[PDB]
Amino acid sequence: TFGTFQDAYLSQLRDIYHSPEFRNAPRGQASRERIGAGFRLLDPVQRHISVPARRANVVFNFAEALWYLSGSDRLDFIQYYAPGIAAYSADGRTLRGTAYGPRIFRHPAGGVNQWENVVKTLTDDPDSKRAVIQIFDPRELAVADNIDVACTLALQFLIRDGLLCGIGYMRANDAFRGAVSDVFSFTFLQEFTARYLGLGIGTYHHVVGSVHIYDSDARWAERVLDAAPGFPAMPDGDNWPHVRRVLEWEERLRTNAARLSADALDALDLPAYWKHVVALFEAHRQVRHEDTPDRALLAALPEVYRQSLAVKWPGHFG
Amino acid sequence: TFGTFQDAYLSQLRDIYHSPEFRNAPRGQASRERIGAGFRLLDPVQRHISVPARRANVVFNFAEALWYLSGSDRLDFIQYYAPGIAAYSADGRTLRGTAYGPRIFRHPAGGVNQWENVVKTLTDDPDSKRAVIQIFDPRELAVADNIDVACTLALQFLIRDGLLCGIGYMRANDAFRGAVSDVFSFTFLQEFTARYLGLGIGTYHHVVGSVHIYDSDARWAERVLDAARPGFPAMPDGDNWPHVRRVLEWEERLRTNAARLSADALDALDLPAYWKHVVALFEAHRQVRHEDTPDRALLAALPEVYRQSLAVKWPGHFG
Ligand SMILES: Nc1nc(=O)n([C@@H]2O[C@H](COP(=O)(O)O)[C@@H](O)[C@H]2O)cc1CO
Ligand SMILES: Nc1nc(=O)n([C@@H]2O[C@H](COP(=O)(O)O)[C@@H](O)[C@H]2O)cc1CO
């Protein structure tokens, strides 16, 4: 049990690095591995990694989470934030097991909106043990040479003592890279669902069949291990309308069809929390489309976001 | 980490009974509960509970595991061994989320045989992290007033250092009743698959979202904790499918009382000893359920673990 994700993250990293149960190479990828590893987070909202050596990218974090909420399988959206992700796209325009959006909101086994069913289930029976969103699909193993098989099995939500608790079940997780965005996204969905239901946030449990550090990340992992402000709360109630507007801005900014000044960002008809997210996308637009870094944009952000930007793009925001 | 399932079972039962995290009533069923609970078993073949006050039923345990291997959703098969399982059947004919057989061998999503796909995946890439059998299905929550939603999410197998390791992921598990048969069946599947692949048996990991004791079982759970050996036999090496097919033939004939076998007939069956003993369990159960003469010579030839289970479960017949 840990207070924040960062504590759990570093502890797990040091477990796998120092005492791997196995060294092997699934699909030719040499790794240090532990089996059946998990942890419990007391404050899932504190979901960010702030160790400068890790250079955690809060823009990608929100982008992935919102990509999931959009229900999209499209590569163009997500690869703009994570260029290496195209390696998992067979067709060069969609992602398959990597795209959790369709798994949540239109699962290929029946075309089911599981999020809605979870909400209904917990509304009809608050104590329910059945409120599960399945991610993995039985057909992913049926075809050979599949380059993108879902590594998350399911996400479960439970209301306990008036608080929404979350559990992520994974068959496999990159403990150094992927875990950072996976735990961010799962706890983001947990918080989002809690606000929708009018509940407080409980604990988050993470459990994984194979947790591993790829040997190709060993140097960077070592640098993070040698190294050594609060994440803001999402506003109460139904955030879908705000998410819809944020997604409109995301696309306009990503395609460089529009740009927002510090004053224009503050003028947006959005809660402060979501204004800052759009601000992250404007900052990312400045990077990607080589536009002038706005220091006034930077100064208005929550400190956690300022730090992430300054460390990730020090030439722009340092 | 525990050596045997009994050690893990008793430790967990004590945790939930005496130190529950929550008290609630999902679907109106008052319970003591802990969230995010699991264990590791170093010796998954030792999968049985022998505490007399628990009255663990080894015949049901094998019947459930074989019911799964048969790929069947039929109620008639399984309710013969566990009459109370009828409560989860909406049609009096089949089970839905309780029936893991079809989920494994012809999953609702595509009709996929996931066991075959797991074996192929591990054959092509021994180190694979992908060898998962999905159990749960997204349509189960879309069924209005569903009385039988799968509580197992998935089973995963990994080949590590020449051993097959197993992981059972469940959204919910009854710590008193269900856990006994679930861990039996999952470790049975694990062993069966290891033998088929020519591997030794690795660790078994059990991971559960909600682990609970129902208040209706509190008195019995207390008797077990207040009350608190011989080894469980190993399944033969190699491909056991042919033996399983033969055992399922005998299972059907004995259950329907369409056949019966004496102790000497059982001993002379053309099966490995391990599987002969399982057929004998079914013959013993037939004697009980169809009111035939108990064969004490049958009882005497069984492994001690099975003798004990029969003696405690049916003391009037085998005590
Ligand atoms: N969300 C994810 N988390 C992750 O940790 N991964 C990583 O990508 C790997 C996919 O390779 P396998 O299908 O061989 O497990 C996982 O083992 C895991 O290390 C991938 C995704 C999907 O992009
Ligand atoms: N294999 C099983 N193990 C189990 O432990 N169960 C128990 O049956 C309950 C089913 O009710 P829910 O769908 O409300 O979780 C589970 O919570 C669990 O307590 C049921 C089955 C299938 O009949």
Kindly list the residues from chain B whose CB atom is less than 8 angstroms away from the CB atom of residue A120. Answer: 141
Helices A303-312 and A272-288 sit at what angle, rounded to 10 degrees? 10
**Helix, strand or coil, per DSSP, at residue B145:** coil
> Nearest-CA distance from A166 to chain B in Å?
9
- Which of A273, A49, A52 lies closest to A181, judged by CA? A49
Pocket test residue of A146, A173, A184 for ligand 1, highest count of atoms within 8 A of CB: A173
Within the 67-96 window of chain A, which residues sit less than 8 Å (CB to CB) from chain B?
none
Of A110, A144, A149, the CB nearest to B139: A110
Domain count, chain B: 1
> Helices marked H in chain A — which ranges?
5-18, 58-69, 75-79, 100-105, 114-124, 178-197, 218-226, 240-254, 262-266, 272-288, 295-300, 303-312, 314-317
Q: Phi then psi for B57, rounded to 5 degrees?
A: -105, 95
Question: Within an 8 Å CB–CB cutoff, is residue A141 touching chain B?
Answer: yes
CA B317 to CA A43: how far, in whole Å?
57
Cβ atoms A44, A191 nearer than 8 A: yes
Torsion sign over Cα B268, B274, B280, B282: negative
Q: How far is CA A12 from CA A5, A39, A112, B10, B165, in A?
A: 10, 9, 34, 29, 21
Nearest atom, ligand 1, residue A27 CA: 14
CA A199 to CA A122: how far, in whole Å?
11
Cβ-based neighbour number of residue A161 at 10 Å: 10
Residue found under tokens 């974090």: A61
Q: How would you label B65-93 residue by residue, b for 16+ Cβ within 10 Å and e otherwise? A: bbbbbbbbbebebbbbbbeebeebbeeee
Q: Classify the phi-psi angles of A2: left when phi > 0, otherwise alpha if psi is within -120 to 50, otherwise beta.
A: beta
Contact B114 A171 (CB under 8 A): no
Cβ atoms B63, B79 nearer than 8 A: no
Cβ atoms B274, B233 nearer than 8 A: yes
Q: How does DSSP classify residue B86?
A: G
Nearest atom, ligand 1, residue B128 CA: 14
Q: Which residues on neighbouring strands pair with residue B2, listed in sequence order?
A: B41
- Specified resolution (Å): 1.8
User: CA-based Rg of chain A, rounded to a whole angstrom?
Assistant: 19
- Name the helix (H) or strand (E) containing B71: none
Range of the domain at A210: 1-318
Cβ atoms A142, B114 nearer than 8 A: no
Nearest atom, ligand 2, residue B212 CA: 19
- Name the helix (H) or strand (E) containing B78: helix B75-79
Question: Within an 8 Å CB–CB cutoff, is residue A113 touching chain B?
Answer: no
CA B217 to CA B222: how far, in whole Å?
9
Pairing of strands A200-214, A163-174: parallel
CA B66 to CA A249: how far, in whole Å?
56
Cβ-based neighbour number of residue A297 at 10 Å: 24
Q: In what order do the strands lie in the sheet with B200-214?
A: B22-24, B31-41, B200-214, B163-174, B152-160, B132-134
A149 lines ligand 1 (CB under 6 A): yes
Of A38, A114, A142, the CB nearest to B138: A114
CA B60 to CA A117: how far, in whole Å?
34
Name residues whose C-beta falls within 8 Å of residue A166's C-beta, 6 or more positions apart in sequence.
A44, A155, A156, A157, A186, A187, A189, A190, A202, A203, A204, A205
Within the 28-47 window of chain A, which residues sit less than 8 Å (CB to CB) from chain B?
35-36, 38, 40
Distance between Cα B149 and ligand 2 center (Å) = 8
